[PDB]
Subunit: 499 residues, 4 copies
């Protein structure tokens, strides 16, 4: 035989075996006599408007496509569960961490960042690793990546960053001038750029990569006491990457390498797993941290803030219909149940708005009613009504204003957010200089060895060689600030490339 993925139809047919074909109908449920020949006057005559079989089917075909995700368009999904294995109730009261052995269903979507829906999986790019927890207190979406950090630290630079990574607005071609002019002008990108151009830049499928929340988050316990945290979910299959050589080969031999790998792993029973950890920081410590605790361009040293086990994530089910279950999947960082709150991270703050907003556009106003997006483990009861494609019963005839004297849904005091104190002027504080090299120099010296640093520079130079000399100069100058050797090596490569 061949892989399970390849036998998808063969298997569907087999699953039906005995049963005979169902009757083919129009969208309105009308049986059709012949869906292979159009209705005309005479065998060589005109098509009739009276052929509603044709119109019904073609019209739907004409409307199959929806906008792809503005970012992370190319992805793959699966479903499974989360199981608590350690008690962290001292930090969070979230019913999802409620007690060891507690399992909560989950939905996951892996993806690249820049490429469109037709792009290849095995290419250098960060990797999305979004997890949706269907908890009793509604859904909790942990929208992380395969890296604990990011290129920028203020949401205002996000649209620009993404544009620099995508296509030139006139030629529609990738543009090295755009990529590096941006990166060279914004030195804060050094930390994640180093990671991206390291071996971890091209993971071997979605099962051999780590997942992180990246953002500092806030956990609150049953006492009302809070602590800041970081979510870490390490791959139990272990880290494994593709050489720049195999990745290019797979890019054309099988652009859906990641998708195929995941589906087959699950179909064969080789369920992928991750171990979820959290490193905790107290407000006292946060106020002492040598760096901005909420600066997305920085990590919390494992030595000072050890990883603590929380539970395990297992994907043991492939989607049945990809469009309905994966393409329409929607993760909102703002989706947080009692016990988990956001931090002041400027990037996370912006994401609180961005996701539901883009989901209302890409999917629709009632996108939370799409099966895979419904918090089906909780009871949605509120004063929201109508909107296009209003499914279910739209909460029936329940009073639609609050407060009301007719017993409609009520407050839940115990669900109040944790109160924190803040003081300062309301202004746009520049964070462009919040130390852009310190942690990068260490990544470059302690995280990577001599051979890894070797590839790191070859990959950077291989891409940067296409940018204008003045951009290469600014670019090199930045790497040099991190460490003189960092810049010198790349400059050496560029001198050769520039021949």
């Amino acid at each position: 035989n061949r892989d399970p993925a390849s036998d998808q139809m063969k298997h569907w047919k087999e699953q039906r075996a005995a049963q005979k074909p169902d009757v083919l109908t129009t969208g309105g449920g009308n049986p059709v006599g012949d869906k292979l020949n159009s209705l005309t006057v005479g065998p060589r005559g005109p098509l009739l408007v009276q052929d509603v079989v044709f119109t019904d089917e073609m019209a739907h075909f004409d409307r199959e496509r929806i906008p792809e995700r503005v970012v992370h368009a190319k992805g793959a999904g699966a479903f499974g569960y989360f199981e608590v294995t350690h008690d962290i109730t001292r930090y969070s009261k979230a019913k999802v961490f409620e007690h060891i052995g507690k399992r909560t269903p989950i939905a996951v979507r892996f993806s690249t960042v820049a490429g469109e829906s037709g792009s290849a999986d095995t290419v250098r790019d960060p990797r999305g690793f979004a997890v949706k927890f269907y908890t009793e207190d509604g859904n909790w979406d942990l929208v992380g990546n395969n890296t604990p950090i990011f290129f920028i630290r203020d949401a205002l630079l996000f649209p620009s960053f993404i544009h620099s990574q995508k296509r030139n607005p006139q030629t529609h071609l990738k543009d090295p001038d755009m990529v590096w002019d941006f990166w060279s002008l914004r030195p804060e990108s050094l930390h994640q750029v180093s990671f991206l151009f390291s071996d971890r830049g091209i993971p071997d499928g979605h099962r051999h990569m780590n997942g992180y929340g990246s953002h500092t988050f806030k956990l609150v316990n049953a006492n009302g006491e809070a602590v800041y945290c970081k979510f870490h979910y390490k791959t139990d299959q272990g880290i494994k990457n593709l050489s720049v050589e195999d990745a290019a080969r797979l890019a054309h031999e099988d652009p859906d390498y990641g998708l195929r790998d995941l589906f087959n792993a699950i179909a064969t029973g080789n369920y992928p797993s991750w171990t979820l950890y959290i490193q905790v920081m107290t407000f006292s410590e946060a106020e002492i941290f040598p760096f901005n605790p909420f600066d997305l361009t920085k990590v919390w040293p494992h030595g000072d803030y050890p990883l603590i086990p929380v539970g395990k994530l297992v994907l043991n089910r492939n989607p049945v219909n990809y469009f309905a279950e994966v393409e329409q999947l929607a993760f909102d960082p703002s989706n947080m149940p009692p016990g988990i709150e956001p931090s002041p991270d400027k990037m996370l703050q912006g994401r609180l708005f961005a996701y539901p907003d883009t989901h209302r556009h890409r999917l629709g106003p009632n996108y939370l009613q799409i099966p895979v997006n419904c918090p089906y483990r909780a009871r949605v009861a509120n004063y929201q009504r109508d909107g296009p494609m209003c499914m279910m019963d739209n909460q029936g005839g329940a009073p639609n204003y609050y407060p009301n004297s007719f017993s409609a849904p009520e407050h839940q005091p115990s669900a109040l957010e944790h109160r924190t104190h803040f003081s300062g002027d309301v202004q746009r504080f520049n964070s462009a200089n919040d130390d852009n090299v310190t942690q990068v120099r260490t990544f470059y010296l302690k995280v990577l060895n001599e051979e890894q640093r070797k590839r790191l520079c070859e990959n950077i130079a291989g891409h940067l060689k296409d940018a204008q000399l003045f951009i290469q100069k600014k670019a090199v100058k930045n790497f040099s600030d991190v460490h003189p050797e960092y810049g010198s090596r790349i400059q050496a490569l560029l001198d050769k490339y520039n021949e």
Copy 2:
């Protein structure tokens, strides 16, 4: 006490025993701690983006509205059943007519025509009377009106006719010049105009008016023999009309008079019903009919084509949530099950295209997936997939191309359409002069009495009086062609009006 419509909330309240009210949540199912006070920095400080309770609720409120129907925007709905009382299987093989006593659930929506969603019920205008039969062979939508005829007989004049009935493109005001310039210029409208301005122009609610399929349709039997027909559903409540004075009064007194009437009636167990009849014309008869059997401005004389009893239409269930079950209702004339087909009526032909089209716009590509529009009494299976707001399971992993060797849905030759022969050039044949008066004269002097011919001419003059003199002149000419008296009478009234 008060009527049931007024105690809607009182009943919702008392029908929940002492049941503890539900927990107020976000669209994502997250419990809300306080949804009466926004999140700010200090008692008099600015609002935070972090307040996702606010954004989640406001963003949905911001998207509650959807485009109202392009016509028939103001209406009311109710649900019930259809019940066969006579065997007409000799004429049609449609499963809905299967056997005596067979019941099929129906959905109904009554409406005015020109007024927008905020308009008054008690106004002069035809009345939409659409019936959706959820049959085993899919949904059958009989999209009728409270009149057996219409103003025009070609779909190309429909948007123009509707534009003339609505608002002036610049002032946004009703424009008697547009109304009468169009009717005067197109005399085929005489018949229905005569009906509209007679007492039946303003029914007393929806329960006291008849329903008509209006168009000539085609019924096919098991033997494959065909015949043409007209559907008639007479009110078992009796014909009742509102006086011009009472209607004007109710316009401001109760703009939703029809809504209330229907809801309270069903709420008090006073279920309105209609008796469905059909007229039958053989193909032979159609070849010799003195008029075009498919001319929408003509009725079939009951003296040659008597009403044939079929079944009963009963409404005994009010909607629970109006937006979900009524505003979202979509009737498509093209939704016809085996045994019922369209005739060459040009207006009907046009409608085969228009309804599904506007629904894909007004509601969305997958509107047939909205609960009320779903053919839940049939098994929908085809090769259509995806589209925005895709609920269900999108037919899982079933093969999506036809034909296929994997046991997916198969068409069924039993559902093939009856075959009619046609010969002719592909041209735009004129129908503007297909006898515009013959049947109108008989309606004026043979169908109406003097007591109401007086009322007919008054109503017409009361409206026509505001169009320019040249428009009135022409309009009067048409009324004269029907009958010199008809014209003269109207002219006299106008003469007094013009002072």
Copy 3:
């Protein structure tokens, strides 16, 4: 001849006189041969898909409607100019106030609140009075009402209040229980309710009422000094209202009363104008104001904060096409040029988000590209691109990321917002008990005269009578809390109504 509005087409034909009427075409610009008859095979044959003239027209007709505004759906628009008459330069550096006599084009839309698109103009309800200033520093949208205050003072309560003012979720009928239960439970609305049921409750058209920014705003001068302010625009044609009985008759005789009045006033050269004033309050004063200066339910006493003249608002141009210039008009309170900023008013803060949001839904992502919404006196230059229905050149080939070394647009520090210092815990502060009767007492006793007080209570009782008894009790209990005579006078009339 009749009134201008009535002669709209007559006048269109006249200005066209002598000109050969344009060739009618498809949306694609192809000339049409006969748009009055469909293409069929034979006179009484089937309609052809080949009839693309029919489809092009019918498909656009089927897509004519867009969702109506979620609130303020029924309205009227006009255009004109804003003229600076006085110098408020020491307060605001905004270019629109630059020099005495300076003219800035304006767009204005008047409207009711609860009624949908087809509702009547002359009904009890607040009046929208939105003004868009097309300034060199971009558009400034002063989205005002005919009242200085509002029913609530926290945005979270807005969707509920509107829900209570519209239709019952099941019956689709107006529901006094919903209306008064909400008002009963939230007494902060007493001030606006009192204003709403006074004679001002039903203005004689839009030309005889004042406008107000309602909210407290912030003005900043060239030196960086800020003050808080209130915007008031009083009518130059004087306050004039319709009696309950007069408004009621007009409701059915001319539901577009306001529309007609405005169009005719302008068409006949009787341009309506308003004088814009501001009240100023220094930061020191806001600090000692008897109430929360940012509470939308409070006004600023004229004796302590005199109206300071600013300029004139003149409407001298009617819309040419209503849908394009009025239905499509979008006002965003967040559209504020340098020199004008928001205050901490919680309601206003919520509005900063809501309008752009609903506009992207109702109109589309690029609604600011619709002519009437375009800041045509400014040069839009930024890093935003694409989106559905992208017009113009989408900023051509300009670098689309910021920062960049290719001279694309640059931010301007002078446009930086004014820095205010805020301190406090981050939480949901209860504002439900922020003095709900003080100014209402003054309103009832000092502002109104026995004559007015009389029918103010009769207006209230006439509507509150339909609510359930327990609701009437609490409502009266809130009026008595204002002034015993207020609540007692209501009770007397109620007792009577309950026969």
Copy 4:
């Protein structure tokens, strides 16, 4: 210094000499003070909703994407002109052919078929070659391909065909079982499958392939006489194809090979051109053609129906903004000016409906208002109005109903469609067995040589080898019907591949 495409930004920067950079504004035209830092309370405080610069920008970024084309999603565009070189006014009265030398502006888009927006250009697949002619009689869209024929001859199988060529609905992977099951079940696909797997399957860029209307169309002269025709635009650059190995190389090295090649060619002054010809068939010859002349799987032998020269197509201008000028480009086969009409081709008949339909979904109801889609060389004037994103003036205050007595646009008899007669039963005539091998045999034996037949069979086997054996067998059967050796040679390859 590099290729023009690579220097896009450099050239733009240089094009703005010393001109000062524009001021950065919000969508509403308000200058932005600092677009690089968000508005927060203190340097490490929360984000404020008051930051309307952020929300304005992010909200638009969140809405950048629109559905990609259901098919032909990956493509490139350019602009230029059409020039008449020969006189064919004896066949067509279309203004575009009016006289020798006559120049008419054109827009062109090249594309692949199955791949999504991120897919590679150098892949085996047919190639789209749509040409939009902006004529005075409106736009004429000749939506062609790089092949004169297609896989199927009835539109009802188009959605299925495209589905079979796309991703598996469950695994989201290309599925050879789907591809070959469909093809093996529909042998009519043999002709185009043979052209597809030949050298032609992978042209070298877009400048080295021919164009074809594929369908048989109808031309009508000034005397009302009509002939059927075929459109052919041969590349003046000459046919040039990519080796299977070089295609897989560019597939990963430059997924945008075709995009780059075209832009550079035009940028460097090396304008690509095509010579336009027509094949003509009288109605008499049509009656005697050995095959259905309207059969899309058939070509008209050049020996019997010689190519007649008409003019040249030249592309001399690159788009400035790709999204606005190419991504939003909409071609409707139904856009045909007088003198050019459709034939009875069942496939073309379906396309008359599908394109404007999908465009109203992908782009919007008023997509014909997007600049690149407007028929700017004509005057659009009709009775269509409103719709979302209505630009310009919506035809102002012009009467909106037809007919009318107010001088609004009038139809033109000279534009009536040609008259053709048809007689026959209205039914679904089976065309599945309309000779599926005769011309395919001629192609395999006469058009190709041994060298080419060898590659053809290798290419087919290379893909077919991955489908199930039963599918392989049925597929080989069909090839054997074309020619015993055709099938045998492939079988030989298969046996090898099958291990």
